[PDB]
Amino acid sequence: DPPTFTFNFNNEPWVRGRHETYLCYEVERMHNDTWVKLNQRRGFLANQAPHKHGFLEGRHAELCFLDVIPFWKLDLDQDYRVTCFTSWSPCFSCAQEMAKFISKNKHVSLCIKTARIYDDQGRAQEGLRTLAEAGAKISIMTYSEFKHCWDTFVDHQGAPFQPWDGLDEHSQDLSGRLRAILQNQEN
Template sequence: MEAEMPARRGWQIEPEEFLRNYDPIRCPKKTYLLYEIKWRKHGKMWRNWCTSSTSRHAEINALETIEEMQQQRTRTCHITWFLSWSPCGLCSRSIIEFLKAHPNVVLEIRVAQLFRPHDNRNRKGLRDLVNSGVQIFIMSPFDYYHCWRTFVAHRGRMDNCCFVPWHPLLWMLYNSSQLNQILNE
């Protein structure tokens, strides 16, 4: 008799989606954004995810959802985003405006890849985010492991092993170097 696999939770994505979109070597067709919100007052954690659509970027979709949750502007929270692509210049501006309207929100962004890193608007957007207090990092092997264990509905597959994409480790290092160069311009 086979063991019953745990059901997928609404805030989890399928393993294939994660592997396809968060691989730092591949170019995902759309942006995925996994996020955690920790409310400081109660210590509760809330998780969800969204993607880009034909009309809106994933960052805008996430900000709209978070806006609905921020009914009381005095509620302090720490938000961590795990993005398949870094924000574009336009999304960076929207994020900054959101943070200005919600000064009690702390945002940390971890990305698998840099989106069009040679585009000056995207480079400036990343610097502006950092100058507005946002922390931006390239996803580390620990981040991949955390996302796999937390956001992926693996239903026991690879549950007992550490999911770390060792084969693209050089790409992670390259992306980190590129991000540091952009932020230090």
């Protein structure tokens, strides 16, 4: 057979927030002081809008699952068990908003293992610290959690996907930054 593989998750652009963004998530509906789930889906698609009919601004992972919450329309005492797997930690307004819903109430546990993000300081740090501090537990899902990212949302668990050195660069970035952003250690 001819050795021809397609890598859309590699270094090659495939997120940039909105638009055809490769993203994955996992959410559970917490009820009766416990945890439960009433759906069968692992990860997410590489685009916006989960279903058809009803889409204007679009949901980029952050507000995506955030939408799945009102989708269940829990009572109130319930809790949001949401987990995300994106190629980037936050988003300017997508995260700023997300952060709110999560920072506007104490009852939403999240684990966003993101690949990596690169921003100067302005027009990005807002959704960064906000969503990352009062929005969810953002993890640096680079080369390491990347291989695992597969082991969690792949039928084969860790598909034969080759990692790019950039992961070493980005990983080191998203991580070291995420520490500076959340900690706000200005130095």
